Amino acid sequence: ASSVNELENWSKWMQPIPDNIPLARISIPGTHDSGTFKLQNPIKQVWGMTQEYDFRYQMDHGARIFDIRGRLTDDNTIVLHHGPLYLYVTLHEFINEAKQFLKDNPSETIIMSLKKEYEDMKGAEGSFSSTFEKNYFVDPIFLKTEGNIKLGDARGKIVLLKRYSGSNESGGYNNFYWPDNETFTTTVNQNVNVTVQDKYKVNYDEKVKSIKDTMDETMNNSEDLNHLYINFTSLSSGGTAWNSPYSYASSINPEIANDIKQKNPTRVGWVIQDYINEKWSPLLYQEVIRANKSLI
């Protein structure tokens, strides 16, 4: 009952992929700084807005990886931030939206990257890691196993990608050294080789070339099941209308999407983008999802 066209149902595209395929092998669309969609102040937007729509919109369009940046509060909760700015979005808000999506579409999995974005507030009873584990992670929705996580074990659950230190509970992908503004390679869950392109503050041409170089590598290493490729197409703000995350995404998203469309590869990696929407064609997240055709 599995056909390649089933990859076209953006809310259930992982359904046709076999249970035994490692998530690392699947080409998955993701959203950079996922919770910035509520920013209204034009000054806050030009500097930190990276998405126009909420979490469910993102998921219904195919996004399965979410970049969550939070801050520990005096209430022993974690809220979403962009630097010192509160995004009016909370961690529980994201998880609840993910729970709803997973309930409605049990064939899917949601990968949640969690990073400490700003200094803990005074008054918290514990640490960022201990508070997350005690008040959020205990929830059954979170996958508690590790290794080269397979889709079958992830269906209906949230798979954690730690970007914070001090973890004391098993589950998801372990935290690893993440050099600043670079393309680097390292290892994670004992047997998973990881390559990340996260040059968030390089010049535009350098960014475009870096995305392409890393994707070219991914396309020619399609059978490497234990290799994880994370490719951020997002680029940090210059503080003006002509160099905001939106202006950059308007050209980068269609450019990279065309690369995939023209090459028609069997793997392109975990592509984390800014502004998932239907304004620019070809649509990046759709071409990324379509690159899983050979897995069916």
Ligand SMILES: [Zn+2]
């Ligand atoms: Zn309080």
Ligand SMILES: [Zn+2]
């Ligand atoms: Zn909401």
Ligand SMILES: [Zn+2]
């Ligand atoms: Zn490898």
Ligand SMILES: [Zn+2]
């Ligand atoms: Zn739409």
